[PDB]
Amino acid sequence: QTKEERFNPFSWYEEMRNTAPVQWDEERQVWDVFHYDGVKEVLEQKNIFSSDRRPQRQTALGTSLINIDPPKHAEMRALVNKAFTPKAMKAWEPKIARITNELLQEVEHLEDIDIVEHLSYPLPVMVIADILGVPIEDQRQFKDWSDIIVAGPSNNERETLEKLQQEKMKANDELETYFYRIIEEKRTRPGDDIISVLLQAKEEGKQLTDEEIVGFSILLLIAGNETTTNLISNTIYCLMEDKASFERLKREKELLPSGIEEVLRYRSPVQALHRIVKEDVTLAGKKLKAGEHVVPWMGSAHRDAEYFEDPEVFKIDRKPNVHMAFGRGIHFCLGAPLARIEAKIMLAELIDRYPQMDWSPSFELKPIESTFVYGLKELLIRKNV
Ligand code: HEM
Numbered sequence: 001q002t003k004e005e006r007f008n009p010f011s012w013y014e015e016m017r018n019t020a021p022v023q024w025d026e027e028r029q030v031w032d033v034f035h036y037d038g039v040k041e042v043l044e045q046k047n048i049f050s051s052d053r054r055p056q057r058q059t060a061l062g063t064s065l066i067n068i069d070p071p072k073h074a075e076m077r078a079l080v081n082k083a084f085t086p087k088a089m090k091a092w093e094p095k096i097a098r099i100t101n102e103l104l105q106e107v108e109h110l111e112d113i114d115i116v117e118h119l120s121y122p123l124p125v126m127v128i129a130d131i132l133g134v135p136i137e138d139q140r141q142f143k144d145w146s147d148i149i150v151a152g153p154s155n156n157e158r159e160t161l162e163k164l165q166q167e168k169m170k171a172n173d174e175l176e177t178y179f180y181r182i183i184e185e186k187r188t189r190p191g192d193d194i195i196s197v198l199l200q201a202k203e204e205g206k207q208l209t210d211e212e213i214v215g216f217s218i219l220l221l222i223a224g225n226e227t228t229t230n231l232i233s234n235t236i237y238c239l240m241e242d243k244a245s246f247e248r249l250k251r252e253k254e255l256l257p258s259g260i261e262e263v264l265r266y267r268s269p270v271q272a273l274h275r276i277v278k279e280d281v282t283l284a285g286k287k288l289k290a291g292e293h294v295v296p297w298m299g300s301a302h303r304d305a306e307y308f309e310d311p312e313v314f315k316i317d318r319k320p321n322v323h324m325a326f327g328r329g330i331h332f333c334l335g336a337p338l339a340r341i342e343a344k345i346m347l348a349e350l351i352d353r354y355p356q357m358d359w360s361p362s363f364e365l366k367p368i369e370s371t372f373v374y375g376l377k378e379l380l381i382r383k384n385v
């Protein structure tokens with residue numbers, strides 16, 4: 001399938017919603033769930049559809065929020081919830097604006113810029129590194145590691161697969177090794193960051209192993225390299241694709257939060273997730289069995305015509321917009337407030353500064369090679385100042 005099509009899975013989504021919104025895929029050995037209500041039930045019904053990824057060695061990543069079920073999930077989420085509320089995140093608006101204007105300043109001398117390299121990717125890893133309290137100087141190791149962990153394979157063969165899994169194991173092992181070192185440093189001289197806050201809470205007897213702190217830290221770091229960058233760049237993509245939306249947005253700046261919500265629906269940074277059936281369940285007439293894997297495609301739910309009038313049309317003012325781009329239920333994204341404010345601040349600045357931006361003459365579509373993570377490796381824009 002050409003790159004063009006891998007950036008447009010929405011035709012396959014449509015085809016499945018209108019034939020079998022829940023179906024077992026022999027090749028990939030999963031139940032695909034494509035319709036809105038099904039994606040919602042899968043994500044919500046945590047006692048039916050489990051988040052525990054059972055591999056034969058567990059990783060620290062496998063003990064973090066995203067891979068644990070109740071009761072362990074609520075106790076662990078509770079320790080970190082207050083650090084990521086919309087109010088907690090208002091303190092960071094000024095740092096984000098400063099970081100945005102710093103990065104913009106560095107490529108001011110360029111007529112043509114890569115949104116991804118110069119803007120959408122640096123800002124979120126700089127925030128997450130300040131949140132974790134690790135040296136931004138390691139950003140290259142952070143991206144290479146995070147890229148492996150979210151990477152997808154070229155094909156479904158047993159030997160391309162087997163070799164990717166090997167790289168992910170090595171990258172987990174090196175990510176763990178790295179953070180165990182950080183954890184010792186921060187026991188010696190703590191800092192103002194969430195690794196210390198967690199360590200301070202383990203001091204005080206909260207049920208918390210150092211492996212659990214490492215895993216959470218790795219989850220955050222990976223989120224800081226592989227999510228908000230695609231919201232921002234995918235937003236610019238939609239605005240360059242439909243210049244009518246871009247012209248309206250420039251005239252009505254108050255539409256930017258709404259426009260970012262519609263990008264979340266329409267070019268979702270995360271197209272799907274993974275669950276495991278805990279006990280036999282029936283779902284749209286299909287007989288799901290204990291232990292089978294399930295893939296709810298939020299990207300497809302987001303085009304479901306019964307919930308989104310004219311699903312195929314990008315509407316910056318879309319109302320209602322009840323998307324599940326950040327999930328649904330007890331695992332709903334922890335960084336959603338942070339993501340929303342990182343995107344608003346950098347996008348507003350970009351649009352204010354380069355109202356005549358357009359595709360660079362060397363632009364090429366370069367979709368990310370992943371099945372879940374959805375975005376572009378590169379987005380070359382001509383400023384036209
Ligand atoms: C546009 C940006 C983002 C998108 C689209 C996104 C998407 C998601 C989704 C769909 C989930 C649900 C996972 C599941 O149910 O398996 C999730 C969970 C999570 N997200 Fe994000 N994310 C984004 C940014 C961030 C950021 C910036 C952070 C942290 C700094 C973050 C941290 C987390 C964490 C820790 C969880 C696990 C919560 C739990 O399991 O209780 N995300 N994210």
Ligand SMILES: C[C@]12CC[C@H]3[C@@H](CCC4=CC(=O)CC[C@@]43C)[C@@H]1CC[C@@H]2O
Nearest residue numbers: 149150222223226227270272273372373
């Ligand atoms: C990519 C993935 C689905 C999306 C997840 C990812 C782990 C890191 C993560 C942090 C988030 O905020 C949700 C999206 C992502 C990016 C998962 C690892 C295996 C699965 O394919």
